[PDB]
Amino acid sequence: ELDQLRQEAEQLKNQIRDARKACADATLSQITNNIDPVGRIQMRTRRTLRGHLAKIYAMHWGTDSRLLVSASQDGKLIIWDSYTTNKVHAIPLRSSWVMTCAYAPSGNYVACGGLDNICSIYNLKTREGNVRVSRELAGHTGYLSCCRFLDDNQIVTSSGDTTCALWDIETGQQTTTFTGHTGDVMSLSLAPDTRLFVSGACDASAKLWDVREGMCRQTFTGHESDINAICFFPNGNAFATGSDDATCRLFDLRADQELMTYSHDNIICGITSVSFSKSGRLLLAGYDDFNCNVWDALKADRAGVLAGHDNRVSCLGVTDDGMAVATGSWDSFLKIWN
Amino acid sequence: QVQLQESGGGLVQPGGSLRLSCAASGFTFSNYKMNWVRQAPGKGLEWVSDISQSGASISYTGSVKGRFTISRDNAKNTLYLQMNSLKPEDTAVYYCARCPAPFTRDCFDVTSTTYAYRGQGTQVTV
Amino acid sequence: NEEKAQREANKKIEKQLQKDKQVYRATHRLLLLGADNSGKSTIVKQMRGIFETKFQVDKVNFHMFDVGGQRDERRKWIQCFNDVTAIIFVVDSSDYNRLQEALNLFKSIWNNRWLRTISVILFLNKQDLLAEKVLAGKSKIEDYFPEFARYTTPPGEDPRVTRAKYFIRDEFLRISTASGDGRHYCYPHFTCAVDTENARRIFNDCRDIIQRMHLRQYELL
Amino acid sequence: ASIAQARKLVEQLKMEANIDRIKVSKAAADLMAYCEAHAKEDPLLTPVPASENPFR
Amino acid sequence: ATFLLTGIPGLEAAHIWISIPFCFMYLIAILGNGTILFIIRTEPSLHEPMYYFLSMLAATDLGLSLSTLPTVLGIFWFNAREISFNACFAQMFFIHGFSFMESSVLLAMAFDRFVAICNPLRYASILTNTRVAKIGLAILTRSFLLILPLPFLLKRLPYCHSNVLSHSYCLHQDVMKLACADIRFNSIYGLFVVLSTMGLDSLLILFSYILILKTVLGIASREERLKALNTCVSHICAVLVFYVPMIGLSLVHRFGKHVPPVVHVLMANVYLLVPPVMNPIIYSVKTKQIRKRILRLFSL
């Protein structure tokens, strides 16, 4: 009978809610009431990268924190040199509807995907010297939303058919599949030790996955609308999400509940991207009002504004050593802030 | 999480009356546009009515004009549908849908097969 | 030593990007949208994953995309098409049961935040079936739309066919002109299953849209 | 049909429920300790002289 | 030898109320043109064929203001009315060169607007960036080639009679009257150039506006018709105020034997001092993409 199963499911949901309520005793805001404010964080544009014809959806930094890759809707991948603004490479793509890009940890490969439902891997260091397609990973049903390189051989991708997958680039078959989401999976974030990852969906839900065991461990709720971005804390025991209700929230894996929310009355536009600084003290979030705000993670008080873009901010990333932050936008211009 | 529970179904003779109520929780009710959706047996999801954020604008489908009335109560976070002069073609399961995003006036995908912000449904038979 | 090689590579890439810029600015992009019942596939085949179609009229290149490999929920991937010249909307006017679905989709597209600057070209397809259904006088329209009982025409078979055609067109135009910022319009056309003027109609409508954009840009509007 | 989905959901809830949890205060203390531990190596948080700045 | 300037025949009042409007107008011209040029040449989103011609017009206006500033300022503030033999000819060369540059820039802007509005779907296939650069080079060459003989021929001639001028700056048609001998060829060549190569320009600009108005008449309701008419009248007035008292002065110098010199002073002052201030406001500042940047810069 379906009715008894539904009653049992809601009974377990009530039990989980009661356990979470009992496990909470204090709030993070009151614990951090005795620390000093960060102050006014003023950042200036140090570089402006020009050359993209159309709007930008994705970018990714390199491990050396010098070269980065950006994807655009005219159908081009460009590898930059943020020190001198020289275009190292320019890769023309087969499909112009590209929604994501990735940079290999070893720096030999890049990947991209979009409405074509196919993820393609490019070899930047071929023996001849040119850039050619190395593999085309097919098997997803919806559009590709995000992809991340575990290492030179394994890549994890999320699609719009409410599933994630783990690929083997050498052979091209799906090693593992992750299921359980109800809406489109919009973003994923790998753990610092690359043993777990999270994923946000259009169901206002986030889940924690085990790469080896291949099952969902925990599920976190609290948002009221679709989730657009997600990012791990530097120590690997927390993450932050950005949604369409114009709020961000910080979740803790061990406590298995929300810790703090970052919102203001004057903001009515959703968040398109989030990121953390090197030490985790500052949280940077992009908004639909053409601005990016800098938050105080331990205080939930705004501390800075970046106002250099004339259109929607789509992507935002911070280098490994935290020397700079790069933000792309829908007006086809990248900017390095410091 | 978003929770929408509907109640009010039952057996009504033709020409009778019936009232449907939906109790909403887990989100701010006053920032969202609400819908009523029904699904007849052997037929896909069909839109019925919607009401604005404050109830200023009300619209219905063609076949229910002059018989159905939709209202919302922001004080207690409830939605209502007042059925009148029921017909044998009105038998279906009634779902209450929600606008995906706040402060907007467009509603994508409320009648989709796997919409997330939709209720369990109640059975109405005439 | 490496600076000279880096500069030379940058210069080569800039030249290639300039050529690509010229080629990209040359052409125009369109989005073909509709439902399964509507004969949009037949339309795109008449002037013939994503089904691209390139046609050229008066030495001007047009590009049309018909995405069909996705799921039912389209509120997230629809934001990739906010820079197109126009949206082609195809409606099967002979099916009264699913006309309100078309009206709801049109309203959702018209009132979107990122699609509030894109003009829509409306095609009301399947005219022969509508004429046959109206003449055969078996399935009525007044019971689907009760407002049809107090409507007067503002075709050759009878005035009833004209009345029905213009009633449906007026429904769509009322939704169009209800709420608007005078930044985008709607161009309704009456097309049948077999026609050869769709390319010319698209050319004229796109020319009007572009001219209006240029007038606004040059402060004349 | 839906019975299998309900059974899978029940199994997932049963597997998720039986996990030990710690207090919020411990998590807050750990996050603080990490922040004050690594606050000395955050160029964005603490401005640095332009001599070592690679984007000068 | 030195030429003795005279300036306005009303400066004997110790410029109590004359120097202030001139200084304010020069300041407005210089500041506006410099700000527009800097904003256009700094921001990457304003790299379009339409804005290149606006920047060229700003550069021409700034050059004309700087070329005419020194002698006027000296005569109206330091009471200095003596100019050397070579500075006079340098000023005469620069003034005419920049006037021709301004006329050519206006013609290029008119062609740009006509192609953009009357040829909407083929606009990007005609006005690429390389053709804009070619047009700029052609404008520079045409403007600074037709003026070269004018001071070159006058420099060699011996001036003997009075070495006194009528304006506050050197003009070819006024200076040639003191050559003491054989001024027919210089006068006829100057008149031929100024008429032939520089009135057809105004005719073409007016024709383009007529065609644009004809195109825009049959669009929209009266609400947009009023806006279109207001803009197309502002542009025509801006063109005429520069083009009329400029051909008129060259005509009246040769043909106006009886006209008082006040008319010469007024016409020469108008077409050389008003356009540098009028063109920014009407053409560049009216655009919203530059208004936004100007407001943000002023708030800083």
The count of residues in chain C is 221
Interface test with A, best of B31, B33, B104, B117 (most A CBs within 10 A): B117
| Least Cα separation, residue B113 to chain C (angstroms) | 8
Q: Could you tell me what percentage of chain C is helix, strand and coil, using 3-state DSSP and rounding each to the nearest 5?
A: 45, 15, 35
List the one residue out of C55, C117, C33, C41 whose CA is nearest residue C82: C117
Q: Domains along chain E?
A: 3-299 (1.20.1070.10)
CB contact under 8 A, C219 and E216: no
* Contact check, Cβ <8 Å, E45/A331: yes
Beta-carbon contacts of C65 under 8 Å, excluding residues fewer than 6 positions away, are C29, C30, C31, C32, C50, C51, C52, C53, C81
Residue of C nearest to B66 (CA): C146
Residues of chain D found within 8 Å of residue A16, distances taken between Cβ atoms: 13, 16-17
Query: Scanning every residue of chain A, which has its alpha carbon at the shortest distance from the alpha carbon of D6?
Result: A5
* A78, C3 contact by CB (below 8 A): no
Could you give the angle at the alpha carbon of E268 between the alpha carbons of E262 and E274, nearest 5°? 120
Probe site for chain C from E46, E53, E113, E121 (most C CB atoms < 10 A): E121
Distance CA C129, CA A192 (A): 62
Touching chains D and E? (3+ Cβ pairs < 8 A): no
Residue of chain A whose Cα is closest to the Cα of D54: A83
Q: Would you tell me how many other CB atoms lie within 10 Å of the CB of residue D40?
A: 9
Instruction: Tell me if E125 and C211 make a contact (CB, 8 A cut-off).
Output: no
CB of C24 within 8 Å of any CB in chain A?
Answer: yes
CB distance A257 to B114 below 8 Å: no
Q: Among A241, A161, A233, A227, which Cα is nearest to A196's? A: A233
Whether C14 sits inside 8 A of A51 (CB atoms) is: yes
3-class state of residue A89 by DSSP: strand
- CA pair distance B89, E33, nearest whole angstrom: 74
Nearest chain A alpha carbon to B26: A224
d(CA C62, CA C82): 17
B13-19: long-range contacts, CB 8 A cutoff, minimum separation 24: B13/B126, B14/B86, B14/B87, B14/B88, B14/B126, B15/B85, B15/B86, B16/B86, B16/B126, B17/B83, B17/B84, B17/B86, B18/B83, B18/B86, B18/B124, B19/B80, B19/B81, B19/B82, B19/B83
The residue type at A292? C
From chain A, the residues in CB contact with C69 under 8 A are: 115, 117, 141
CA dist E127 → A191, C111, C143, E53, E101 (Å): 51, 35, 57, 12, 20
CA torsion sign for B113, B119, B120, B126 is negative
Residue E283 token pair:
């053409």
Token digits of residue A279 = 């030490």
A116 touching B, CB under 8 A?
no
Closest CA to A272 of A195, A330, A338, A323: A330
Cβ–Cβ below 8 Å for A281 and D35: yes
- CB-CB neighbors (< 8 A) of B115 in chain C: 73
Subunit contact D41:A278, Cβ cutoff 8 A: yes
Say if residues C103 and C68 touch (Cβ distance below 8 Å): no
B109 touches chain C (CB under 8 A): yes
B·C CB contacts under 8 A: 40
Residues D44 and A277: their CA atoms lie apart, in Å, by: 7
Tokens of A282: 């500052």
For residue C70, the distance in angstroms to the closest alpha carbon of chain A comes to 5
Alpha carbon distances (Å) from A44 to A308, A325, A326, C59? 9, 11, 11, 47
Going by C-beta distance under 8 Å and a sequence separation of 6 or more, which residues neighbour residue E99? E64, E246, E272
Q: Out of E117, E128, E287, whose CB is closest to C22?
A: E128
CA pair distance C133, C131, nearest whole angstrom: 5
Q: Do A183 and B103 touch (CB under 8 A)?
A: no
Largest alpha-carbon pair distance within chain D? 67
Helix-helix angle C127-136:C159-178, to 10 degrees: 120
The answer to whether C16 contacts chain A (CB < 8 Å) is yes
- Find the radius of gyration of the CA atoms of chain D: 23
Give the residue among B41, B92, B99, B51 at the shortest CA–CA distance from B71: B51
CB atoms closer than 10 angstroms to residue C128: 12
Q: How far is C56 from chain B (nearest CA, A)?
A: 34
User: Which residue of chain A is at minimal alpha-carbon distance from B27?
Assistant: A224
Residue of B2, B114, B120 lying closest to A224 (CB–CB): B2
For domain A2-337, the CATH superfamily is YVTN repeat-like/Quinoprotein amine dehydrogenase (2.130.10.10)
Report the 3 state secondary structure along chain B: CCEEEEECCEECCCCCEEEEEEEEECCCHHHCCEEEEEECCCCCEEEEEEECCCCCCEEECHHHCCCCEEEEECCCCEEEEEEECCCHHHCEEEEEEECCCCCCCCCCCCCCCCCCCECCCEEEEC
Helices and strands per DSSP (H, E), number in chain A: 2, 28
Q: Please indicate if any CB of chain A lies within 8 Å of the CB of C76.
A: yes
CA distance E146 to E164: 27
Residue E7 class from Cβ within 10 Å (0-12 exposed, 13-18 middle, 19+ buried)? Answer: buried
User: Is E119's Cβ below 8 Å from some Cβ in C?
Assistant: no
Give the residue from chain C lying closest to E122, CA to CA.
C60
Task: Give residue A100's identity as a one-letter amino acid code.
Answer: T
Q: Domain with B79 in it: what CATH number?
A: 2.60.40.10
Residue of E42, E43, E45, E48 for testing the chain A interface, max A β-carbons within 10 Å: E45
Kindly report the CA angle at C114 between A335 and E42, in degrees rounded to 5? Answer: 30
Looking up tokens 């779902």, which residue turns up?
A: B95
Instruction: Identify the residue among A49, A310, A330 best suited for mutation to test binding to E, counting E beta carbons within 10 A and taking the highest.
Output: A310
The beta strand positions in A86-172, using DSSP E, are 89-92, 98-103, 109-114, 118-123, 132-138, 144-149, 154-159, 163-168
In the DSSP assignment, the letter for residue D54 is: T
For residue B75, count other CB atoms closer than 10 A to its CB. Answer: 8
Domain that holds residue D21: 3-55
CB contact under 8 A, E113 and C26: no
Nearest by CB: A142 against C3, C20, C70: C70
CB pairs under 8 A between A and E: 6
Are β-strands A196-201 and C53-57 bridged in parallel, bridged antiparallel, or unpaired? unpaired
Tell whether E47 is within 8 A of chain C (Cβ): no
Residues 149-178 of E with CB under 8 A from A: none
d(CA B108, CA B111): 8
Nearest by Cα to A261 from A15, A28, A3: A28
How many structural domains comprise chain D? 1
Query: What method did the depositors use to determine the structure?
Result: cryo-EM
- Cβ of D35 within 8 Å of Cβ of A298? The answer is yes
Distance between CA atoms of residues E22 and C170, nearest Å: 62
How are beta strands A45-49 and A334-337 bridged, if at all?
A: antiparallel
Give the type of residue at C21: K
Confirm or reject contact between C77 and chain B (CB < 8 A): no
Closest residue in A to C67 (Cα) is: A115
Residue numbers of A between 273 and 332 with CB closer than 8 Å to D? 277-282, 297-298, 318, 321-325
Nearest to A238 by CA among A280, A195, A179, A200: A280
Domain boundaries, chain A: 2-337
Residues of chain A neighbouring C49 (CB-CB closer than 8 A)? 115-117
Distance CA A96, CA A77 (A): 10
Domain spans of chain C, in order of start: 2-218
Task: Return the CATH number at D33.
Answer: 4.10.260.10
Q: Which residues pair with A178 in a beta bridge?
A: A164
Q: How far is CA B40 from the centre of its chain?
A: 14
Which has the closest alpha carbon to B72: B122, B108, B46, B33? B33
Report the C-alpha dihedral over residues E90, E95, E100, E101, rounded to 10 degrees.
90
Determine how β-strand C119-125 pairs with β-strand C186-190.
parallel
Find the CB nearest A182 among B103, B114, B120: B114
- Distance in angstroms (rounded) separating the CA atoms of residues E117 and A181: 51
Taking alpha carbons only, the member of E242, D39, D18, B53 closest to residue A36 is: D39
Q: Quick check: helix, strand or coil at residue A58? A: strand
Task: Give which of A56, A97, A98 to mutate to test C binding, by max C Cβ within 10 Å.
Answer: A97
Could you tell me how many residues make up chain E? 300
C211 in contact with E, Cβ within 8 Å:
yes
- Residues 162 through 201 of chain A touching chain E, CB cutoff 8 Å: none
Structure's resolution in angstroms: 3.2
Q: Mutating which of C54, C70, C82 best tests the A interface, going by the most A Cβ atoms within 10 A?
A: C70
Is any Cβ of chain A less than 8 angstroms from the Cβ of B27? yes
CATH topology assigned to domain C2-218: Rossmann fold (3.40.50)
Chain A interface includes E299 (CB < 8 A): no
Phi, psi of A8 (to 5 degrees): -65, -40
B98: left (phi over 0), alpha (psi -120 to 50) or beta: beta
